[PDB]
Design an enzyme around this catalytic site. Sequence first.
Site, PDB file in Angstrom:
ATOM      1  N   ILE A 153      40.564 -25.426   4.370  1.00 44.74           N
ATOM      2  CA  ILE A 153      39.190 -25.561   3.893  1.00 44.74           C
ATOM      3  C   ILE A 153      38.172 -25.562   5.036  1.00 44.74           C
ATOM      4  CG2 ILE A 153      39.663 -26.731   1.725  1.00 44.74           C
ATOM      5  CD1 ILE A 153      38.807 -29.380   3.267  1.00 44.74           C
ATOM      6  N   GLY A 154      38.584 -25.945   6.234  1.00 47.16           N
ATOM      7  CA  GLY A 154      37.692 -26.257   7.342  1.00 47.16           C
ATOM      8  C   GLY A 154      38.426 -25.909   8.635  1.00 47.16           C
ATOM      9  N   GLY A 169      37.943 -27.204  12.965  1.00 44.42           N
ATOM     10  CA  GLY A 169      37.264 -27.619  14.185  1.00 44.42           C
ATOM     11  C   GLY A 169      38.019 -27.141  15.425  1.00 44.42           C
ATOM     12  N   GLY A 201      41.626 -28.776  15.583  1.00 41.03           N
ATOM     13  CA  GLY A 201      42.201 -27.662  14.819  1.00 41.03           C
ATOM     14  C   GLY A 201      41.778 -27.614  13.341  1.00 41.03           C
ATOM     15  N   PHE A 248      40.876 -37.425   0.575  1.00 45.62           N
ATOM     16  CA  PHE A 248      39.959 -36.317   0.548  1.00 45.62           C
ATOM     17  C   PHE A 248      38.645 -36.853   0.004  1.00 45.62           C
ATOM     18  CE2 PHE A 248      38.096 -33.139  -2.351  1.00 45.62           C
ATOM     19  CZ  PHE A 248      37.609 -32.246  -1.402  1.00 45.62           C
ATOM     20  N   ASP A 254      31.513 -39.715  19.699  1.00 42.31           N
ATOM     21  CA  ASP A 254      31.059 -38.458  19.079  1.00 42.31           C
ATOM     22  C   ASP A 254      30.353 -38.648  17.748  1.00 42.31           C
ATOM     23  OD1 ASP A 254      30.441 -35.751  19.376  1.00 42.31           O
ATOM     24  OD2 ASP A 254      32.423 -35.054  18.507  1.00 42.31           O
ATOM     25  N   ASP A 266      36.420 -38.313  12.692  1.00 44.85           N
ATOM     26  CA  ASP A 266      36.535 -37.621  13.977  1.00 44.85           C
ATOM     27  C   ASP A 266      36.647 -38.612  15.155  1.00 44.85           C
ATOM     28  OD1 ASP A 266      36.449 -35.327  12.285  1.00 44.85           O
ATOM     29  OD2 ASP A 266      34.438 -34.658  13.028  1.00 44.85           O
TER      30      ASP A 266
HETATM   31  N1  LIG Z   1      38.443 -30.219  13.528  1.00 39.44           N
HETATM   32  C1  LIG Z   1      37.960 -30.791  12.647  1.00 39.44           C
HETATM   33  C2  LIG Z   1      37.342 -31.535  11.563  1.00 39.44           C
HETATM   34  C3  LIG Z   1      37.006 -30.620  10.406  1.00 39.44           C
HETATM   35  O1  LIG Z   1      37.321 -29.417  10.359  1.00 39.44           O
HETATM   36  N2  LIG Z   1      36.368 -31.254   9.425  1.00 39.44           N
HETATM   37  C4  LIG Z   1      36.031 -30.572   8.196  1.00 39.44           C
HETATM   38  C5  LIG Z   1      35.116 -29.349   7.862  1.00 39.44           C
HETATM   39  C6  LIG Z   1      35.531 -29.997   6.493  1.00 39.44           C
HETATM   40  N3  LIG Z   1      35.083 -29.575   5.156  1.00 39.44           N
HETATM   41  C7  LIG Z   1      34.999 -30.398   4.090  1.00 39.44           C
HETATM   42  C8  LIG Z   1      34.186 -30.025   2.993  1.00 39.44           C
HETATM   43  N4  LIG Z   1      34.114 -30.789   1.898  1.00 39.44           N
HETATM   44  C9  LIG Z   1      34.821 -31.926   1.881  1.00 39.44           C
HETATM   45  C10 LIG Z   1      35.639 -32.291   2.958  1.00 39.44           C
HETATM   46  N5  LIG Z   1      36.302 -33.485   2.907  1.00 39.44           N
HETATM   47  C11 LIG Z   1      37.131 -34.067   3.813  1.00 39.44           C
HETATM   48  N6  LIG Z   1      37.737 -35.174   3.476  1.00 39.44           N
HETATM   49  C12 LIG Z   1      38.617 -35.552   4.465  1.00 39.44           C
HETATM   50  C13 LIG Z   1      38.643 -34.754   5.554  1.00 39.44           C
HETATM   51  C14 LIG Z   1      39.514 -35.034   6.720  1.00 39.44           C
HETATM   52  C15 LIG Z   1      38.694 -35.679   7.797  1.00 39.44           C
HETATM   53  C16 LIG Z   1      39.439 -34.444   8.069  1.00 39.44           C
HETATM   54  S1  LIG Z   1      37.602 -33.448   5.367  1.00 39.44           S
HETATM   55  N7  LIG Z   1      35.748 -31.513   4.048  1.00 39.44           N
HETATM   56  C17 LIG Z   1      36.984 -30.092   7.062  1.00 39.44           C
HETATM   57  C18 LIG Z   1      35.234 -31.391   7.126  1.00 39.44           C
END
Ligand SMILES: N#CCC(=O)N[C@]12C[C@](Nc3cncc(Nc4ncc(C5CC5)s4)n3)(C1)C2
Length: 290
Positions: free
Chosen positions: A28-29, A31, A34, A98, A141, A159
């Site tokens: 879904i995402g 960084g 990773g 989540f 951060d 993070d």
């Molecule tokens: N490298 C790096 C970090 C990274 O890529 N962070 C993200 C872009 C994301 N997109 C979205 C969108 N909507 C909802 C959501 N919810 C999440 N709940 C729990 C999560 C876990 C904490 C990781 S992420 N995450 C994945 C946040």
Amino acid sequence: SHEQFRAALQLVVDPGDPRSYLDNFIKIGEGSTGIVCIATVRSSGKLVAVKKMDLRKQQRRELLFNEVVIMRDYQHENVVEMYNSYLVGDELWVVMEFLEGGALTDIVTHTRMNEEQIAAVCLAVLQALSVLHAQGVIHRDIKSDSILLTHDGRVKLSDFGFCAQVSKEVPRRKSLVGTPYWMAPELISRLPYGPEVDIWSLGIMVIEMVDGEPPYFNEPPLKAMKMIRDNLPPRLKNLHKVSPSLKGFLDRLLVRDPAQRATAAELLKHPFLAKAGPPASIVPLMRQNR
Ligand SMILES: N#CCC(=O)N[C@]12C[C@](Nc3cncc(Nc4ncc(C5CC5)s4)n3)(C1)C2
């Protein structure tokens, strides 16, 4: 080192592999440290998030211990919940709740938060930061990307890869760590620093919430750092749009001298935060319903 490292991190994570209970791994995402997936709990279809981090693609391998231990040792209503952690091949996987509302960045770029919402986010992060900092953990951060929101508008800090810790033997840290535009002046000018670097970064995030971006966002990172280093505390562009109280609050955060800078403990008593609205007041800023 690689194998040394793997063996050591094998000891601090749960054993095995969470395919055991999880289906429907979909990215879904993404960084630097990773990628991130959703997966579902096979027996219920409860959704989790799984962050996958390559031990070989890290810039500072040892920063991976943080990805696991900060969430395990500082559970709190404003800290993202971690369920388990695992080594899979040569990736570290961390399974977490989540949080359906995404990152604060999505909001601050597309909408203009009101003060109620802003105070809400400020209380949240300060609660987390009071606890980490009471133990001498510096986040390092704090930014809008680092903040997640549930469907129902609770806020949690996320993070933690950049965390460092402070004691009587090492009372300050010395590393150039953080995100350039959110970095404290003492941090930048390579002066030894404590948890006060978070509070300045929190300020800069308030400026996100009001102005849509932090100062000098349009300068290349090294030049921006130079300016935070050299100039006085940055102005709000939309100063005229904020109450005296948000300004009182922000002035206690963006103080060049870290000693004069308010602590998280001090700030929880600031009356700017009485303004803070329920979870449910933040819910309309999500992209879903907006
Ligand atoms: N490298 C790096 C970090 C990274 O890529 N962070 C993200 C872009 C994301 N997109 C979205 C969108 N909507 C909802 C959501 N919810 C999440 N709940 C729990 C999560 C876990 C904490 C990781 S992420 N995450 C994945 C946040």
